[PDB]
Structure formats: C-alpha cells, structure tokens
C-alpha cells in the first residue's frame, strides 16, 4: 500500500512537471515579445530622430532659443531623476544588507524580525492599494453613463 | 573655517585661529549635548562632508604638506582632535575615514595616527604640547569602545609602535644620569603623562593578547615568531630581577615624594 | 508525537514570496518595487503609525453596533478567528523573553 | 522467517522525498509566474511610447501639414512632464520612508512590550484592511454588475471583460 | 525529479533574473531617449513660431520641477544627507538579542502563520480588485467616446 501511495504521489507530480514545461514556454514568449518590442521602439526612435536631425537650423528665433533651452531642461530632469533613483536605491540596498549582516539560518530573532518586516511592508502595500482602488472608484462613479 | 584651514597656505595665523575657533565651538557644544544633536549637525551637508574628505585626504595621506606646517598649527589641529575625541564620535568617524559599510589599498587610510607616532622627522621631546596632545588623542581613541578593535589590532601588529615604547624606555634611563637644577618641572610632568597613557595602553593590549580561544594551533606560532624569540626574552633573561626593579625603581622611586620635593 | 516542525524558514520563504509577487505588480522600474528591512523598534513605530492611520480609514460603527453578519463574513473569508488569535497572543507576555 | 527485514525507514525516506518534491514544485510555480508578470509589465510599459513615436514617424512620412496644426505643446509632452512629476513624488515618498524618524514615544517601552504592541498592532491593521478590502471589493462588485447590465440593455453585449486568466 | 526541479529553480533564480534586469535597464535606456527624441520633436514642430499660453503653462512647470531637484534644500541635497547618515553609521542601531521561551515558540509560530495566511488572501483579492477596477475604467472611457 505505502509503495502504491508513494507511486501515485510521484505520478501526479510528474503530470504537473508537464505544466512547468508550459510555464517555461509562456515565459520564453514574454522574453521574445519584450526584446522585439524594445528593438522596435529603438528602430522607430532612430526613424524619428533622423527626420529632426536633417532639418536646417536656418531661421531660428529668440523664442526657438528659449524653447531649445527649456525642452532640453526637461531631458536634463529625467537624467538627474535617474541619478537620484540609482543613488537612493544604493542607500536602500545597503540598509537592507546592514540589518541582514548577522546572517544565521539557526537564529530565531533574525527570522521573526524578517517575517514581521515582510508583514509590515505588505500591510503598507495593502493600504496603498486600497487608496488606489478607492480613488479609482471615485473616477468610475463620476464617469456617468448616457 | 575648514576652507580657511585648507586654502590659506600662506597667512598661517588664520589657519591657527580657525583651529582655535573650532576648538571653542566643540567645547561649547560638549556643555550643551543635553540640547544640541551634534551628529545631525554634521550629516546634512555634502559640500561640508566633501570638505572633511578633502581635509582628511590632505592630512592623512600627504606627509609632504605636513612638514610645511608649523608646530603651532600641528599642535592646535591636535587640540581640536583631543577635544572632539571626548564626546563627538561621529565627527571623528569622518575625520579619520573610519567608515566602512581582494584589493587591499584601503589599509593605508586608518594608519595615519600610527604614522604620527612613528614619522621621525618629528620629535617627542622638542615640543611638549604636540607630543602630549598626540598621546591624549591616542588615549581617547583607545578608551572609546567604537574605535577599540579597529585601532588596537593596527597598533598591536605595528612592530615599530613596540619599538617606539622600547626607545622611550631609553629616554628615561639615558636622561636620569645627566640633568640637575632649573626649568625641568613642566616637561617632567609632560614626560610622566606620556608614560601614564603608554602604561594604560600597554595594560589593555596585554589583556586582549589571549582570548581568541579557537586559534589554539596558530596563536602559539604567531606570538613566538613576529616578536623574535631573542628580543623579548633578552629583557627578562638579562634582567632576571626585572619585575623587582620595575617595582622598586620605576614604581616606588617615582612615588617617594619626600625625595622629589623637599 | 510527530512534530510538524515549526520552521521559520518556510514561514519566511512565504512572507518573502508574497513581497516578490507584490514587486511584480508595482512597476519593475524606478523607486516603485523596493522594500526596506527595518529593526524591531522601527517595525513597532511604523506598525503604530499604520494602526493609528488605518483605524481612521475603517468606518468602524459605534461599538454598540458590532455588525455580526459582516464579522461572520470577514473573519471566515480571511481566517481572522479572534478566539484563535487571542489564544496565541495570550501566551506571549514579557516573561516569554530573556 | 528469521531472514525478514524491515523497510519502513526507506518508505518514510521516499515519502519525505516526495514531500520535498511537492514543496519545491509549489515554489517553482510562484517563481515562474512572478517572472511572467514582471515581463508583462515591460510589454505593457513599452506599448504607449511604441504607439506615439510610431504615429509622429508616420505623420512625418506622408509630408502632411495638418491644417488644424497639432496643439502646442503636444499632449504627449503634457504627459512627459506629468511622468517627471510622478517620478519626483516617488522620490519624495522614498525619502520619507528611509529618513530615520525623530525619537518615537516607543522609547518609553521595553523591547518586550513594544514587540507585544507590534503583534497587537499588526493584528489590528490586518483586521482594519480586511474590512476596507471586503467593503471596496463588494462595491466594485456593484459597479461591475451595473456596467454589465448597461452593456446588456443598450448594446445587447453579453461579453464580460472581467473573465479571469 | 527533485534534481530536475533544482536545475530549473537555478534557471529561474539566476539565468531568467539576469535577462529580466538587463531588459529593465534597456527600458530605462529607451525611456530617456524617448524624451530626447520628443523634446527634439517639439522644438522642430514649434520652430519659427511664437509661444502659446499652454507652452508657457508647461515651460513654467518644467522650470518648477527643475528647481525642486537642484536648489540647496532640494531632493538631491536630502538624498545626499541620507547617503552620508548611512556612511557614518547614523542608522546602524544596536542589535539586542533574546531567548524567546520554548513555551512561547508554538504560540508565536501559529500567530505569525495565521497573519501570513490572512495577508495571502487579502493580497490575492486586492490584486484582482485593482485589475477589475482599471479594466472597468478603461471600458467606461471608450464607452464615453463612441
């Protein structure tokens, strides 16, 4: 009996290995589609850039100088934002290492503190997602129907 | 004031006055630590923190600018460090680059106070202030728990710090046959203070020397081979009475006041 | 007995898998999908702040209106039996720690 | 008869093996699908810039001077500036989650009492959010039914977009 | 079977994750350049013209969002404080450590575990609710357009 029980258990797990092969093919196709969308956005940016950077600079005005100065300020903002995001992520990833410095897979203090921190950041996400759901409710409710 | 210390290579009274202003600000803050949070006051400002990093990378690394600076500037920079090494732990952590969060170039940085004890362009007699303030800064950092093993291992492995102690032990024994009457008193107090801090430091390094209980096969090789089995044995085998002389001379002859003052 | 070994590995594995799923619906770009490892006083402070805040987002009825049907829906739906929760909590006092 | 051997150790060892294969398999679906959603968000994130760049690439290929000149600045530049605001406020809300808060009232509690207060507060927050979610999902489940009845009345649409994967 | 699952576990946790972070980075490299090419597009399509009141109202907003990033008390400055508080050990608070009593380990395990199983359900339903809400908000927006 116990050999036949374990044999049915192994069989039913092997039937689900066929499903893990399905998730791998789904994941592969997402990796194909994201790659070739990125290589298509790349290609359309090069097909827009090439039209701008083949116009004459003949007859720019004082408005066009202040305009080239301010629309390049917007491009500087995104690059300065990304420098700040990388540096503040470089702070968070160190704070996380600093609390984990005592790594001991036989302690209980480390594990209880992490399970409660995983609970805490999840409860903060649940609050934030209830706010996003409630503010989405207002915009459904003000979207009156004919 | 740190711009005036770093930039004014020329009107050196301004560098000196800036170190004294900073020393009096540190003294005021230490009496008001019931109210003013000194760590936050040195956290906010990367123009200022890059100025401590400019000053530390100047002072810690470049001995070739240090011997352009007068002894009066060197002493009053050490006074600022003696004052802040009491309570202002965060300011000192920056000024030494004691911060952490194979490639071993980094081990050059935290060595600078051990350079100041050993760079024999400078003397430990020829000005009492500089040499006393250096032993006070070293004593404060040795007494402070946050600096302890990170400073004490570097002192213990530096064979020439133990050679400095084995040279100052000659200074006593080679001065004590040669000077009678006038002036001596204030340098004699400064010499006894240098010796007092060195004996506190010696007591603590001798305590730590043995509690690494796991290292049973390696400690008995290290302690027998870094120190030569000549040098430390020759002291106690020539002077077989050496601890009885240490007690009756270097302790009791220094204590017997009715000879030293009439 | 058989012990069902009370492993805080498998409990940590599953608290972290919930976060690793959440950080796939938060944006995988910029300051959107990070988490912070806090120490136990900061967990307590952030927990108090989230308790004082969320208690003012629940329209809790007057305490003489404890809606027995919503109570019976919600605690069965999520598994929040107060008779199991309070029994587990009542063995966790100051003399449970050294 | 006296050459008989027990084997329940091996039959326990194989069961425990098959319990470990099950635990690793459950975790393997979670780790597959976490990656699948992470790549879906990258596909969905490309779709908007991919479209708008491709329309301006096309307008500048018919050589077509729209007589109604496109309004200035263009609505995707309006959206680009608001995309900078949302990153800026994500940075503000990250600073305010990383800065160490000024000394909390909890410095008047032991580690033992503040831990018990943390277990109590997490249990209360978990109840509070369970009520807020159970209400908001019940009312989203009103609006979805009004919408499906509206489509079924006026458009005869018996299609449902809330059919899950 | 146990081996083949660990072979695929290591493929997800190392190989696929290395492809994910590389595609996440290339998304940023394409988003910065989507802004490069759209600022350069708007200069090109506005060239040789006066401003509009909407070009003023948005150029003011581009200056407002530049200054909040670059002033002495800016977002840059405050991330650089925290960068330096972290370097100094102003956030590495002392790690006190305890024996949790063997009488309390079963109570604590089942308390934390009931919270995980409750959080598990709330996240499973709220993830769906935000999706159903944005699907309804998308459908209503096209219904208000026919």
Automatic annotation (TrEMBL), chain A:
<protein>
    <submittedName>
        <fullName>Nuclear pore protein</fullName>
    </submittedName>
</protein>
<comment type="similarity">
    <text>Belongs to the nucleoporin NSP1/NUP62 family.</text>
</comment>
<feature type="domain" description="Nucleoporin NSP1-like C-terminal">
    <location>
        <begin position="1"/>
        <end position="59"/>
    </location>
</feature>
TrEMBL record, chain B:
<protein>
    <submittedName>
        <fullName>Uncharacterized protein</fullName>
    </submittedName>
</protein>
Automatic annotation (TrEMBL), chain C:
<protein>
    <recommendedName>
        <fullName>Nuclear pore protein</fullName>
    </recommendedName>
</protein>
<comment type="similarity">
    <text>Belongs to the nucleoporin interacting component (NIC) family.</text>
</comment>
From TrEMBL, chain D:
<protein>
    <submittedName>
        <fullName>Uncharacterized protein</fullName>
    </submittedName>
</protein>
